[PDB]
Write a protein that binds this DNA or RNA. Structure first.
Length: 705
RNA sequence: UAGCAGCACAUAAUGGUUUGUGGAUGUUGGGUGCAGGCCAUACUGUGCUGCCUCA
């Protein structure tokens, strides 16, 4: 069915408008952004398994910039988890409206290719570098501080120095002899990336210089147990005799192959070529895939924020408000993506508000439609099928984050195309598109409030926007008004709330059932909002359990008895009065629960809502003090089924019999607890019977402990 | 800068199970649809490893 988990569809991935076709043209105005990088949380030495020097990216004058033909909007700063620790990223406009020559742009584009293909090794046989034909068409370039002024600019000199360098295309062929011996220069290695010249010619392993040992030489002990000395190693493995046996040695670390950094995890110089790119900048280069991916994700979320501010009138189109893009990115992120956050909390809050908004809308729009009809219409509008259609129509599927980020497998680098797919497409379930709509509703509710959430629903396409007889029938309700600490402006709502359909003496209001319908959705929403806002910050699963336990007709009947509602209840059914009296007796001492007692509890919420001028707050002021002891009790001790509690205590030893239908239509169930006895329960249903059996067993087990 | 094999978690797939829920031929409740919680087979990713390439 449409809106089911069992139905899956493929969608193309959205690329933000500001990155699409964004290739700088010769002699045309362009934008230069700086990637600001600050080490905000250093990694503990215990997790730094080599105890290597942490490198704050900010300690170094060279960085990267983004060159684009289109402006990038402000996005929240975001963390990236490097081997140094948590680095906060800023994307800052440095220059706007400047021009580049064909030669300058070619130099940038060649270096940009060189980064993704040669440095990062993200060019694969399935990928082609076509910067003018690529959908995501921006260049990344080196920036440096000009003349120690602190001012960053395009380091054209460094790009040209890379182009003149023979070390760009492969390993330099410069062999040292006794006539031209190797001379070590310390300055050339302090921030170097090096390439060993004697091995792995197709895939030269690159290393950072981590340190320079001035106390160690080629005649010193080798790190592999296979060779005694560095000189012996190079002679034995590659037939290379060293010209300078007194040169210092380099302590080296591999260049990182891990390019997903969005979450926390928890040699002889003479035989090396210097790669023209410094190690500081190369450490920054390794972050580019995660940075550009995160940038892409946040830009997609901001595009959706700005679109919703246009379509719904909710927020401001450009910020100097609407939700933070990080919360939209949360509502777009499935738990499968593993990104440290997910939509599930926002979804549940959204669902509760959605019910309320539609219920209120239906109640007010259809003043003559009875409860069962409003309930039926409600059930169709809130369906996963309808919500999927709305989410598809809004173009959410292309914007969702579905899978775990993996640069070489599912990410297309800027200026590349796919040779005709995990790079360009994603497969999504119809239900997940429905769940995302509710999470977005929860995002707009939490950030912008209830009116803004209603306008958001309207933007999706959901339409969400006698007296003597009265005084006689309400006689004595002044004591009830005092008990609930609320006084009605219009006592007809109070009468309606306490009028059963059997109570034909009321000819001046309807029965309670319409106000019951309205009150049900109000109480669900208010309780859910309160549970979501709870300082304990309950998990998605626990929120579901608490919502289920608190939003219940049995609890509402129990409260209605505790707050004397049964004394004001207007009915003409002796049988209903007996069932109520038996339940009232059982509740006063601490058996069928009379539905009508929970229904009038909801109906009075509906009454107060209408009498207060649609004030949810006034309802909550009345109901919160009544419910608080239960909200505290269940939020302290998240509730359980007695059958589940028995199965948790006795998983292999507790076996339940089949349902035996007794002669009175009632179900009987036996639970056998191996070695501990057989306990029978009876009730009108298998669970009242199985729960009664499980409670008798649990009582016996707890008594024998 | 590589491959593989164990163990933790996330995750979709095919089966079952269980709570909720719906109009239904509804002879007095087993037909199907969508959600949660579990049990089983099987996939990927990250991580704790283990063996094993180059150094």
């Amino acid at each position: 069915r449409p809106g089911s988990t069992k139905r899956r569809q493929c969608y193309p991935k959205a690329i933000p408008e500001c990155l699409r076709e964004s290739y700088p043209k010769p002699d045309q105005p362009c934008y230069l952004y700086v990637i600001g990088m600050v080490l905000t949380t250093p990694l503990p030495d215990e997790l730094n398994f080599r105890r290597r020097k942490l490198y704050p990216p900010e300690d170094t004058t060279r960085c990267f910039g983004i060159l684009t033909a289109k402006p990038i909007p402000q996005i929240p700063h975001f963390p990236v988890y490097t081997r140094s620790g948590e680095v906060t990223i800023s994307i800052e406009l440095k220059k706007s409206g400047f021009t580049l020559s064909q030669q300058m742009l070619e130099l940038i584009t060649r270096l940009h290719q060189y980064i993704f293909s040669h440095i990062l090794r993200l060019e694969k046989p399935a990928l082609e570098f076509k910067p003018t034909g690529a959908e995501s068409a921006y260049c990344v370039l080196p920036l440096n501080v000009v003349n120690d002024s602190g001012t960053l600019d395009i380091d054209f000199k460094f790009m040209e120095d890379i182009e003149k360098s023979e070390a760009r295309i492969g390993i330099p062929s410069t062999k040292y002899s006794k006539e031209t011996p190797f001379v070590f220069k310390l300055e050339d290695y302090q921030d170097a990336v090096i390439i060993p010249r004697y091995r792995n010619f197709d895939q030269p392993h690159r290393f950072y210089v981590a340190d320079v040992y001035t106390d160690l030489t080629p005649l010193s002990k080798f790190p592999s147990p296979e060779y005694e000395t560095f000189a012996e190693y190079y002679k034995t493995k590659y037939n290379l005799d060293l010209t300078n046996l007194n040169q210092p040695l380099l302590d080296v670390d591999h260049t990182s192959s891990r390019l997903n950094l969005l979450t926390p995890r928890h040699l002889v110089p003479e035989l090396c070529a210097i790669h023209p790119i410094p190690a500081s900048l190369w450490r920054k280069a390794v972050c580019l895939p995660s940075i550009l991916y995160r940038l892409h994700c946040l830009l997609t979320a901001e595009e959706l924020r700005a679109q919703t501010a246009s379509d719904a009138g909710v927020g401001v189109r450009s910020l100097p408000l609407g939700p933070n893009p990080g919360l939209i990115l949360q509502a777009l992120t499935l738990s499968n993506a593993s990104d440290g956050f997910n939509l599930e909390r926002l979804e549940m809050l959204g669902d509760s508000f959605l019910k309320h908004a539609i219920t209120t809308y239906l109640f007010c729009t259809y003043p003559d439609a009875h409860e069962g009809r409003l309930s039926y219409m409600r059930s169709k509008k809130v369906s996963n099928c309808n919500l999927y259609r709305l989410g598809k129509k809004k173009g959410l599927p292309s914007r969702m984050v579905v899978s775990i980020f993996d640069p070489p497998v599912n990410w297309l680098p800027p200026g590349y195309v796919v040779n005709q797919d995990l790079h360009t497409e994603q497969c999504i379930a119809d239900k997940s598109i429905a769940d995302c709509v509710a999470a977005l509703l929860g995002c707009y509710l939490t950030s912008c409030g209830e009116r803004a959430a209603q306008l958001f629903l309207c933007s999706l396409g959901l339409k969400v926007l006698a007296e003597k007889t009265l005084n006689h029938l309400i006689s004595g309700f002044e004591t009830f008004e005092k008990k609930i600490n609320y006084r009605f402006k219009n006592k007809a709502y109070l009468l309606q709330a306490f009028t059963h359909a059997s109570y034909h003496y009321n000819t001046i209001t309807d029965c309670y059932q319409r106000l019951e319908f309205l009150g049900d959705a109000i109480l669900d929403y208010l309780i859910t909002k309160h549970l979501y806002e709870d300082p304990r910050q309950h998990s998605p699963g626990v929120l579901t359990d608490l919502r289920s336990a608190l939003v219940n007709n049995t609890i509402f009947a129990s409260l209605a008895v505790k707050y004397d509602y049964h004394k004001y209840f207007k009915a003409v059914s002796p049988e209903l009065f007996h069932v109520i009296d038996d339940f009232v007796k059982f509740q006063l001492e601490k058996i069928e629960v009379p539905k009508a007692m929970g229904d009038i509890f909801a109906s009075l919420a509906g009454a107060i809502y209408m009498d207060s001028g649609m004030s949810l707050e006034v309802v909550w002021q009345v109901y919160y003090p009544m419910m608080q002891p239960l909200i505290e009790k269940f939020s302290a001790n998240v509730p359980r089924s007695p059958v589940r509690e028995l199965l948790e205590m006795e998983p292999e030893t507790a076996k339940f019999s089949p349902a035996e239908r007794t002669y009175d239509g009632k179900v009987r169930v036996t639970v056998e607890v191996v070695g501990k006895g057989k306990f029978k329960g009876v009730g009108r249903s298998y669970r009242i019977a199985k729960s009664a059996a499980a409670r008798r067993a649990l009582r016996s087990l707890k008594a024998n402990q």
